[PDB]
Design an enzyme around this catalytic site. Structure first.
Site, short mmCIF file in Angstrom:
data_model
loop_
_atom_site.label_atom_id
_atom_site.label_comp_id
_atom_site.label_asym_id
_atom_site.label_seq_id
_atom_site.Cartn_x
_atom_site.Cartn_y
_atom_site.Cartn_z
N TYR A 144 0.84 -1.20 0.00
CA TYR A 144 0.00 0.00 0.00
C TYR A 144 0.87 1.24 0.00
O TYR A 144 1.87 1.27 0.68
CB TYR A 144 -0.93 0.01 1.21
CG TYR A 144 -1.93 1.15 1.22
CD1 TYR A 144 -2.92 1.22 0.24
CD2 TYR A 144 -1.88 2.16 2.20
CE1 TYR A 144 -3.85 2.27 0.23
CE2 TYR A 144 -2.80 3.21 2.20
CZ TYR A 144 -3.79 3.26 1.21
OH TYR A 144 -4.72 4.28 1.18
N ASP A 239 9.15 2.79 -0.09
CA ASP A 239 8.11 3.45 0.66
C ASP A 239 8.36 3.08 2.13
O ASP A 239 7.99 1.99 2.58
CB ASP A 239 6.73 2.96 0.26
CG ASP A 239 5.62 3.63 1.04
OD1 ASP A 239 5.89 4.35 2.02
OD2 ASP A 239 4.44 3.44 0.67
N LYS A 267 4.23 8.97 9.02
CA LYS A 267 3.98 8.51 10.38
C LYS A 267 4.93 9.02 11.47
O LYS A 267 4.75 10.14 11.95
CB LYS A 267 3.82 6.99 10.40
CG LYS A 267 2.72 6.62 9.46
CD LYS A 267 2.50 5.14 9.30
CE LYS A 267 1.40 4.98 8.28
NZ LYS A 267 0.60 3.81 8.52
C1 LIG Z 1 3.60 1.96 3.44
C2 LIG Z 1 2.58 3.10 3.50
N1 LIG Z 1 2.68 4.11 2.58
C3 LIG Z 1 1.77 5.11 2.54
C4 LIG Z 1 0.76 5.12 3.44
C5 LIG Z 1 -0.22 6.23 3.39
O1 LIG Z 1 0.19 7.23 4.36
P1 LIG Z 1 -0.82 8.16 5.15
O2 LIG Z 1 -1.90 7.32 5.68
O3 LIG Z 1 -0.03 9.11 5.96
O4 LIG Z 1 -1.75 8.94 4.14
C6 LIG Z 1 0.68 4.17 4.41
C7 LIG Z 1 -0.40 4.31 5.48
N2 LIG Z 1 -0.82 3.28 6.28
C8 LIG Z 1 1.60 3.14 4.45
O5 LIG Z 1 1.62 2.23 5.52
#
Ligand SMILES: Cc1ncc(COP(=O)(O)O)c(CN)c1O
Ligand SMILES: *Cc1c(COP(=O)(O)O)cnc(C)c1O
Lengths: 427, 427
Positions: A144, A239, A267
């Protein structure tokens, strides 16, 4: 176990917001029952609206590595806000956090703050394309990277949890530039490359999966991906929104020793506030406005409060013994959950790397998304509710990594095992 | 007027971040190229890292409609954070702000909070395509709807400021599902439907543009749009990230009585914090996960700190004679600027609707981006710098609206006009 207030607020929320929540993952649609409405959180704990107290293993989905409402962070923000929360012009703090980040993350030589992981990932989607001149992208099944249109293909996280198909509302036209492959499958990757020569801009992946459960990369997979991308002049993008500052100060790329071209952050970097970031090699970052042609803006980006929170957070993580403690207490937890699974007669697999772990109700081992989908979702549903009534709060999904914090104590670990033993003794 | 500290700080910034900024327009590239670094903001003022004070007309780009560092807003935040800044689970505060927004804006019956206006615009596009089942969207030249793929084509803000063209990491495969007409060209819109029948999901626009300078819609423009879209069963979407809670409590739709099927909000709704939202008709919002198949998530969405600032900002605007005060001081400032330009021999046009104003260095009138572009940007550049040295901080670009706040006093207005006279008596 009373959840009368939560039930009242949730019911109301449903007429006001879609599904009564601000994010799909907060839905208890797969774990049975309704969501618990929080009231406050502190250190390794969280209290709901009915007074029940829980030991937290979701940690607000990642940001709370130093522990909820960390006093050193909240006092820094109390002083900060006196001067205003947003300027709309540069501020010295941006320089401080920018510098700390270059130092922290191996691949980052230049950074650009954004407001969320979803924003970081979208921006990098664009730069990967602007810098290479190629349109196609390879992402793995079950991973994701925010909800930008092109990433809504074989997505993990809540799409998995809720059993949602890819998309709806994103044109075939755009989605067609997304090439997918099973996680850990290097051959599948080489096949896409030598089938779309001169078309692949790059590969984006969660270096350690956390969104289709907890999946560590096979030996040679990251080094291999580094290899095939250099060979076809493609970009290796990590990511690290979830793994950044958690697996290690420098994230997975520093831990496992593999340096991508670009990495996205989120995060933990915000410290509890909305902060995202993307950075990498200087010559690629040079394409971002106002330095280069790629325009990417944001009103609240780099605001003083957010910068203040991330700064203090990173300064706390930088302390000696930080990652040694997390690994130590998290290892006891994962191992303990596994021993009990076995002792109580349950097929289970899982593991941990620093403060991130996973536990599946399947013999395993788990290597990709399809593997994770074999877990007993009904067993998990009964076990989540059981743990909830015993005062342990875990993510309402079999497809999410679990988090530990520096605020968690051996005691908290032990009470979780004691509860796991009790819950698993039934099922 | 010494800017030594701002200079060295910004110099250092260029080595860490693309352009040395977090958002393109902050680099002052269309106004000379030397930004001032902010240290603190309060009421209607801003202070430099050099000790210089300015009367602010940027207002952190919209958020500060109540004045910077509002006492009641930061006290409420200081209280709130002692309960944690992020939960990761539902909280009662999401319910109250959600109810407030449903009551405030006409077209909204259900909302979904996000972390920025960009996120809201991504979401709304995807929901307009998913609900209708079509792929073409009609955008307008000069309108900025977030740094997104499908929309970075003749956008606003930096685009309609420093002439940023089409794409910026968005392929011909993304920016092809988006049609484009000139702002205020009702006939051009009509053509687009007749020329692309049965395949237009809808039209999205800023009900009053502030991202190509301030531009109001002509007589029956919006009214035409509502009806034409109604007849092809297409959605009308208002991006009121800038206009919402500023032109009026219910924004332009309330002000002018035209109701879209969806709207996007931001800026003011988070009161100085990273927050966004999108809502509209219930039957359409029902497709948003977890209540529906369309995916959209966000880790910090609906966080208590954000909800607190939003709630408190709306309470403060609901008080008596808020927008009436805004209209009064802004008209004075607007009419006064134009008069000074006329008496000094400078061609200029402008206007204001509540606390949002425009001032172009051209006789105009301005009805669209093309007209906006006939402005003498060299004069504006010197005008801006004179004003800056006179202690007045204005948006560093001809193509950006200016903003007024509830903390600006009659006197502040008289002081700006005096600055403007001394300055326009040059150029
Ligand atoms: C690997 C990863 N990349 C992007 C995101 C999206 O980030 P955000 O929820 O701050 O919009 C997440 C969110 N759980 C994630 O775990
Ligand atoms: C400010 C604005 C946006 C962008 O919102 P951010 O919070 O910067 O992401 C989108 N549309 C309009 C009209 C805007 O004014």
């Amino acid at each position: 176990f009373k959840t009368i207030k939560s039930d009242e607020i949730f019911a109301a929320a449903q007429k006001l917001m879609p599904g009564g929540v601000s994010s799909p993952v907060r839905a208890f649609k797969s774990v049975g029952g309704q969501p618990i409405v929080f009231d406050r959180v502190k250190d390794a704990y969280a209290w709901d609206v009915d007074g029940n107290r829980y030991i937290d293993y979701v940690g607000t989905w990642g940001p709370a590595i130093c522990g909820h409402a960390h006093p050193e962070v909240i006092e820094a923000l109390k002083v900060a806000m006196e001067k205003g929360t947003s300027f709309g012009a540069p501020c010295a703090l941006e320089n401080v956090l920018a510098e700390m980040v270059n130092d922290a993350v191996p691949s980052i030589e230049m950074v650009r703050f954004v407001n969320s992981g979803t924003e970081a990932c979208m921006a990098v989607l664009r730069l990967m394309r602007a810098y290479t001149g190629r349109d196609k992208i390879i992402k793995f099944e079950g991973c994701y990277h925010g909800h930008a249109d092109m990433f809504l293909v074989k997505a993990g996280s809540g799409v998995a949890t809720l059993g949602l198909p890819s998309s709806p509302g994103v044109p075939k036209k755009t989605t067609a530039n997304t090439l997918t492959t099973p996680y850990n499958d290097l051959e599948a990757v080489k096949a896409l490359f030598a089938e779309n020569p001169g078309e692949i801009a790059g590969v984006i992946l969660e270096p350690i999966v956390g969104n289709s459960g907890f999946i560590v990369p096979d030996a040679g997979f990251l080094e291999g991906l580094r290899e095939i991308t250099l060979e076809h002049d493609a970009l290796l993008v990590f990511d690290e929104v979830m793994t950044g500052f958690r697996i290690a100060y420098g994230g997975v790329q520093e831990k496992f020793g593999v340096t991508p071209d670009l990495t996205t952050l989120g995060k933990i970097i915000g410290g509890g506030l909305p902060v995202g970031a993307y950075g990498g090699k200087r010559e690629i970052m040079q394409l971002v406005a106002p330095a280069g042609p790629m325009y990417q803006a944001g009103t609240l980006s780099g605001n003083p409060l957010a910068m203040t929170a991330g700064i203090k957070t990173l300064e706390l993580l930088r302390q000696p013994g930080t990652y040694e403690y997390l690994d130590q207490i998290t290892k006891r937890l994962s191992d303990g959950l596994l021993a009990i699974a076995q002792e109580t007669g349950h097929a289970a697999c899982g593991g941990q790397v620093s403060g991130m772990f996973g536990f599946f109700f399947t013999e395993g081992p788990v290597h990709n998304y399809e593997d994770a989908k074999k877990s007993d979702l009904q067993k998990f549903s009964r076990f989540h509710r059981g743990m909830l009534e015993q005062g342990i709060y875990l993510a309402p999904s079999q497809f999410e990594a679990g988090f530990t914090s520096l605020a968690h104590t051996e005691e908290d670990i032990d009470a979780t095992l004691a509860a796991a033993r009790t819950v698993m003794s039934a099922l």
